[PDB]
């Protein structure tokens, strides 16, 4: 692992993640890239060194560190054209913001159109030295991090708008192509007689995973970052960009184990050990675990079975739009282009922070006109997200950067939970066909403009997303900005189009 | 078409339905085989002349004509070493029996080992001339039928026990392989203005399907042969050996649309036309539908909403185990075979009608011991499958021969209809992750030896069958047999195992 102070140097590499051989965006020589760690409040300066030189895939670069609330650095929460202009090529970008009052299981990725899918993506971890859940573990490190990525054989801006499938799983780097019919298998190993908190973190630019380990139950403890109560389950769903922490006992017979990661879509099941990973107990022999009909779940997640683990009042009150400001999300699509009450997302010349910072007074006068949303300061905000057959796709995983928000209604569930529901910051929006209104509450105490979007990549790139430009009078004070980052737009815009 | 007096010739063949060539089963040169017609009430003489080379695929056949009660034909149920010894090599057999009582979509296979997988497999529709929902639509014939099925690349006995997906999904015979990048898609024809009464018949070994067409719906009129109350929905999940007929109203612009088969597991998704089939309007250009992100479902079919056309009363008294004789099924499986109330089905030497008929007297003397369960003559029965991962594999549709049933639990659904519930011969059993515990009603109208099985091939294959001794000492007098079907025993035991 790297960090809390690091170089993280980007740049094009070819890798065989799955046994076949493509041309990617890599960290420090890999991707997935290394772990970042630190602790608790611990103030980050993570250098990012742009080495990229192939534009099919973007000189340019622009990360995102997911989770983190970035307050009073919305200059450095990196989404492109809204907190910053990219990174060019050739030159460095060092992103220095603090851990303030969080710890638990992020990531960071490019956030710079849909270059993380190929491959700019890594997992980071906040350790607690007072985690309040110590006492259920024995082991939590390096070696404890579960990564699950979607891997594409044609890069990102070569296949289609909307690929309908991707080659293969990743788990921890690695996994088998069934198109190809290569790759190895990732091994992660256990101690029989202690007990593991691993850390499952999707970085998916699409699939959903259904996720579980053959013969062993998952005891959740942490979602997106928030502590919850503890909650065994034996499989669980992961939207792309969610986070679980679960307690694994090694206390199964010394063997070698299925871990499983299947897709929504694509290559479906486990022919050859595709979506597959293999749990090996110390002395169990060097073999896959044996061919099997998959096991069934007994006892699957429901996100409404979540609770936080401290006693957490939900902003507002108990009644539908009790709340300062409530706000309803229409979602539409034209074959082309994502909309959110009728506007789709085109990112602006001009970064959405550097136009309010310039001097925009309302967010009727920032661009992109009917996209960026402003929300009043210190306020309860209620948001709803129906699910409609007007945008497919579904389901749709929404994501809210400056902030975590209270899951009041969930996918598949008609209730709603004003007394202690789930904590997160990505959210599935389910279907139409349950009729969902995917519903969540949060206080807006983060000065900047924050992005709202599906974290599906592909649909961010064809504009599903609006950001909220939240306490716009309190943003310029609330945000001083770098020389550095000021630098940032004259670079980018003085390239060529090949350059960039 | 042929039928209702046909000749059945059923031999091996060269075939390349997704664009790859491989040997296969056929019947009258192809498959899958040749729609059977006839109409209410018809006698059927169907002449099954078996002309095999090969025994990879088996030499032998035995066919069964799914859900046709065949009162007093026992003999001609098909039930490999249940109702009879299979047909051997250069000798035919004649299907002799009654569409009594019966009109609606029915179909054809192979019920020996995994035969069917092979290729021996097709559509049989009986037509009623008085059909009550004939005011419906304006077309019912043979282009209006749609098969499904899932296609190995390769053959049954040359792959996995348990295969994990196959290789194309075929529609009317025809699909893309993602295998090897191969296949045409099928064409299903309509003109401006007309109704159309698709018969949807799954001939699936294995994965079920979620079928729709774009930009249409559909208005299920029959379940399993058994007319149900119109209930339009946008998509359906379809099981091994399930039928629905559907109305659709050709109505929208002169187009082609997109008609979707998605296996559950396997290639799932639409890549490169995969899993589909075009529904091509007269007057269209000669092109696949636009390529498009697939529609989300907004009102998929569920099995609660379906209702059987006449009141129909429901056996027994409305409370749990209020018939005659509750059956309780505890299945499970140890890696090898699958087990139903702890014994597996290995087939007898001698089939289950043959002993019989010779005179065994208990359900407790029938091979195989401990899989023969006896029922009483004219009683109401209620049969409930609960789901267990013991039996992984879920969800696995189990199917009654003789007989169809009412559904008085569903999967997915924790209510009890003992009032209108649908009618039908194949039913999902659902999943433990769901606490199901699909519940079925009939009455011992039918004496003879009836199989009820998972109808997913490579399962019963496996073992995961019981067969019924319904109605022990009517059985002789019941179902007179012909010399002909004595004689399939005494052949077909001189045969060498490689001519088998
Ligand atoms: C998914 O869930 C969402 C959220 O529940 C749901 O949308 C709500 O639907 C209900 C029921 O249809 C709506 O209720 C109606 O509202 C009518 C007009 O009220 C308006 O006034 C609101 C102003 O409230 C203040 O405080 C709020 C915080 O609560 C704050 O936002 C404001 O600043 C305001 O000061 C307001 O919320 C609402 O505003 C709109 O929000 C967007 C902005 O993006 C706007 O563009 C939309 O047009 C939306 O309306 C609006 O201005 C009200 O007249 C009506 O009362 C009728 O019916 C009741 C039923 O009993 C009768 O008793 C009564 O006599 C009236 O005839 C009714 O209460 C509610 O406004 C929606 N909420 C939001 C936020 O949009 C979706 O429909 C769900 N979708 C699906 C598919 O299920
Ligand atoms: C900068 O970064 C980009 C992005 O990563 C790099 O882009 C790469 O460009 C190269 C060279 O143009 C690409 O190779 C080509 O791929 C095309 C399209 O491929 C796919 O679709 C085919 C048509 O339907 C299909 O047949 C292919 O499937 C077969 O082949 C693959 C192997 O590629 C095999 O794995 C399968 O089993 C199949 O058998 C495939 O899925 C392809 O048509 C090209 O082949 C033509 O041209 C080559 C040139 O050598 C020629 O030899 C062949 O005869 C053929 O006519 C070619 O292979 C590559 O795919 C791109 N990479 C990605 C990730 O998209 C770019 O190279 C980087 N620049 C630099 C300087 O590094
Ligand atoms: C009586 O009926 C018999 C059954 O129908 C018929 O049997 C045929 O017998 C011939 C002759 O032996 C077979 O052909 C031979 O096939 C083997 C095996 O090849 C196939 O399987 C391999 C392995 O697949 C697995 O592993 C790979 C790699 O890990 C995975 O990708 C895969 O998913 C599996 O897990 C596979 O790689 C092969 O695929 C390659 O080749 C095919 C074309 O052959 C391409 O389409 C594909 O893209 C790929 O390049 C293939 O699927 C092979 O090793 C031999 O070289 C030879 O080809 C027939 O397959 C078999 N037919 C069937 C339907 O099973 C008898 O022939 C018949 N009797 C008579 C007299 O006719
Ligand atoms: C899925 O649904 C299943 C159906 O509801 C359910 O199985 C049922 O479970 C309930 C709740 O525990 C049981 O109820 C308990 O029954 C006992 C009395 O049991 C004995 O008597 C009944 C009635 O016998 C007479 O009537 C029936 C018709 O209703 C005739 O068939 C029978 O011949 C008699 O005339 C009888 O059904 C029981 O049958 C046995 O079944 C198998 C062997 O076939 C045995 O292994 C089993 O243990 C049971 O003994 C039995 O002889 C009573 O003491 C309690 O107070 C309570 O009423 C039901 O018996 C049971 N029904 C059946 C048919 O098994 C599953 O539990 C459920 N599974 C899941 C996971 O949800
Ligand atoms: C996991 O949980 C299920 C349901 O709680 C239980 O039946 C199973 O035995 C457990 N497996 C373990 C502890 O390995
Ligand atoms: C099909 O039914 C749906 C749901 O009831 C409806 O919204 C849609 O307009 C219908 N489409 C047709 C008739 O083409
Ligand atoms: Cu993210
Ligand atoms: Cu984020
Ligand atoms: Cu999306
Ligand atoms: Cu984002
Ligand atoms: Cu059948
Ligand atoms: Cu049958
Ligand atoms: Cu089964
Ligand atoms: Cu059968």
Known sequence: ??????????????????????????????????????????????????????????????????????????????????????????????????????????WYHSHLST??????????????????????????????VITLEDWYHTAARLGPRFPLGSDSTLINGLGRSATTATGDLAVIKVTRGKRYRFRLVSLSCDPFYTFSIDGHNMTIIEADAVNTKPHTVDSLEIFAGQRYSFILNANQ??????????????????????????????????????????????????????????????????????????????????????????????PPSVPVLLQILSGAQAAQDLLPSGSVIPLPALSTIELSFPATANAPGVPHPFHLHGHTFAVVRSAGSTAYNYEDPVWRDVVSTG?????????????????????????????????????????????PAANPVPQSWSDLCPIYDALAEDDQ
């Open 1 to 106: 692992s790297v960090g809390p102070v690091a170089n993280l140097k980007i740049g094009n590499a070819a890798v065989s993640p799955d046994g076949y051989t493509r041309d990617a965006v890599v960290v420090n020589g890999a991707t997935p890239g290394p772990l970042i760690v630190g602790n608790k409040g611990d103030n980050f300066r993570l250098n990012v060194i742009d080495e990229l030189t192939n534009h099919t895939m973007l000189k340019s670069t622009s990360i995102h560190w997911h989770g983190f609330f970035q307050h009073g650095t919305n200059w450095a929460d990196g989404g492109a054209f809204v907190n910053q202009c990219p990174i060019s090529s050739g030159h460095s970008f060092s992103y220095n913001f603090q851990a303030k009052d969080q710890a638990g299981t992020f």
């Open 115 to 144: 270059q993380y899918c190929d491959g700019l993506r890594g997992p980071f971890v906040v350790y607690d030295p007072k985690d309040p859940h110590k006492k259920l573990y024995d082991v939590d490190n390096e070696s404890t």
């Open 253 to 346: 017979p010394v063997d070698n184990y299925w871990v499983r990661a299947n897709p929504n879509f694509g290559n479906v099941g486990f022919t050859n050990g595709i979506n597959s990973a293999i749990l090996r107990y110390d002395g169990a022999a060097v073999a896959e675990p044996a061919t099997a009909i998959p096991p069934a779940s007994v006892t699957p997640l429901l996100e409404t079975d979540l609770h936080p683990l401290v006693s957490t009042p939900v902003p507002g009150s108990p009644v539908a739009g009790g709340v300062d400001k409530a706000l309803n999300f229409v979602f539409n699509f034209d074959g082309t282009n994502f909309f959110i009450n009728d506007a789709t997302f085109t």
């Open 431 to 475: 279907t139409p066909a349950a009729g969902d209104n995917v519903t969540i509450r949060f206080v807006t105490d983060n000065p900047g403009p924050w992005f709202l979007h599906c974290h599906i990549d592909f649909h961010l790139e064809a504009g599903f997303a609006v950001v909220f430009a939240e306490d716009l009078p309190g943003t």
